Design a protein around this ligand. Sequence first.
Ligand SMILES: CSCC[C@H](NC(C)=O)C(=O)O
Ligand SMILES: CSCC[C@H](NC(C)=O)C(=O)O
Ligand SMILES: [Mg+2]
Ligand SMILES: [Mg+2]
Lengths: 368, 367
Amino acid sequence: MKLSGVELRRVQMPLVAPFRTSFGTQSVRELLLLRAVTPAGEGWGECVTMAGPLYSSEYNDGAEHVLRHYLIPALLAAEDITAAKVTPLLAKFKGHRMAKGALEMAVLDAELRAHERSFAAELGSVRDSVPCGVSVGIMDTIPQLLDVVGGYLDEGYVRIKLKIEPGWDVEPVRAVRERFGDDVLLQVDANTAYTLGDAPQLARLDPFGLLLIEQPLEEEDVLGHAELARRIQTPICLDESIVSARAAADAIKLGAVQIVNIKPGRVGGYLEARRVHDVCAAHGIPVWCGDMIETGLGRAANVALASLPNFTLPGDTSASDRYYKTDITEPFVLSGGHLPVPTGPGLGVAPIPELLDEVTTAKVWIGS
Amino acid sequence: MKLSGVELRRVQMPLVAPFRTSFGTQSVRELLLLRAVTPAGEGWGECVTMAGPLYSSEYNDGAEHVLRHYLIPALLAAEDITAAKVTPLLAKFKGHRMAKGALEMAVLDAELRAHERSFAAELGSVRDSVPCGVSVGIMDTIPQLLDVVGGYLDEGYVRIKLKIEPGWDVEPVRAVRERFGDDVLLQVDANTAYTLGDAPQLARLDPFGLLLIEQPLEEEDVLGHAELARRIQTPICLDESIVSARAAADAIKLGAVQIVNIKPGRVGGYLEARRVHDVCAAHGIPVWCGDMIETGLGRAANVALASLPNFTLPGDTSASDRYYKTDITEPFVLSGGHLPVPTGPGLGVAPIPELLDEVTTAKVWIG
Ligand SMILES: CSCC[C@H](NC(C)=O)C(=O)O
Ligand SMILES: CSCC[C@H](NC(C)=O)C(=O)O
Ligand SMILES: [Mg+2]
Ligand SMILES: [Mg+2]
């Protein structure tokens, strides 16, 4: 198509329950949505950034700005657009992966709808539903965590993942293991909150049979993770460090990772995400799908992505009401601990206009 | 210090001549300056960022935004403050190294002025003056290049560095070797423009005894360079990959670099730049000072940095007049292929208000 313009929206949605990680506390989600307009039809992208630069350097105001003054203008100046051409057209601009993948997701969605083809079919889905886990924040007390972990297990979540940070690690997993025992799929995630100095502490998690420990060290610190691997029993999983398919190939070559978390926005797009999936598959490295507290737009695309063959561990693609009282799309709802892969053209879902409007804070049109 | 506030201002300065790298051409230089203000006095800082995210992901408006909504408020909220404590206070915020480095510089310069100590003293200077090199852009034609380098040599620049890119690589260096011969110190700089697939092409630079090749491959591709070093004779130098002392430690362990270009802003500040120097010194890795076309404030801090003991290759830190008709500061002027280390307390220079104001585009106070 040609790319007529992009409508860019800021959306603010109430969380059902405040969410705590090693980097802060959230109780509302502020996000950007993009509607790409083409002669052939519309498409939706969700940008995975947050309000400030706390998980990575990208954040809502920054992504809005690059999108509006560099990325979108570049795509608008282009003679031809396809989703694959987006990467080369924007290659001149360094970084901004999450912004780049928002835009690419919107162009992809417009392009597949026009061909009445699924995100799933495009990506190479091989199954119709996917097992879902849940990610449980840091709590103020051990019993609160216990009640909470008890809730999700009763709803049928198939695996539990505990946010951790210095001072909240060995106690919480021991608690969880004493209460629900050893058969429960359990893993932890530090969000870069430890250093190689903490290896003796993190080895105190050996005896608990965790599936993985996710990104214990800082995003640039790849050799560090290869080092840590040599000193702990729990397999290492990278999240923030995997910023591209090449990144994953390097981390694997260096013995820095055994299991990869794929998050599309963080790698610059669904298309690059599939490439991470294939690089990992070629080296024997299982992957699992990550979550950025997306609305139904992103959730739909992630559930599609999670259905690819090398997703061998349950992901973080929980049901909508894990985060949101009211999703802007048809919500995802757990069933036998699975979510079903969407079926129509494109994303397989679309915003319900009235619910979107209720949550829209700002709206802006970028054309020529 | 308790920190009162920071006056952040945008500055635009014209360039003596178009400067063209592998990512595009530039003819003005838009930059941000920072004025930290304490109850004692003030300090200056310069952000090395450009107008768009072409050299890295950071850019003028981005830096302005973080500085204003995150970086500076975090400083003002804090009790006592020191340059060293800036890092832990800003750590919370992922990336934005150049932004953080400007604000750190500005705070350093305040701390230091109150202690009547210069940058050179604080950083560990061992020399009074430093030798300088010149960086030469991509030209339209071979003779237009030879001409420009001819000129630079005569001005007395001790070394030449040539911008390169596919289509402008072996020919220009061949040309420069014929006109000026084997004895001039010569290096090239790709700014990211090749891939490992272009190895045979870059091996073609083997015959010409280049002292290094700066950043042939992408920023994120450290393993790539280790691989390249095995297929070419020219020593590899990294610029954009080196974002911190840890990054240099890692590039050196993986055998991905033989020589390291230090840029204070790129790496998150002068305090980190020193660390990078020291990690590189500890591994026998020579370093040389880079240049981001700074004003005189940036240049004054660079010349102090470039006088640490391990800076043993000539820096990119040219004289004020290489970029600017008029500099907002007493200009730096090439004397014997050298520049002199500033001598005043702190940065040892200050912007002269008559000229700053000529060149300021906008200005905001943050209290
Ligand atoms: C508040 S950031 C969301 C990032 C996501 N965590 C959640 C637990 O799915 C990832 O860090 O695993
Ligand atoms: C304005 S472009 C970035 C600046 C710097 N080059 C010049 C040669 O000093 C770097 O490429 O080494
Ligand atoms: Mg994570
Ligand atoms: Mg360079």
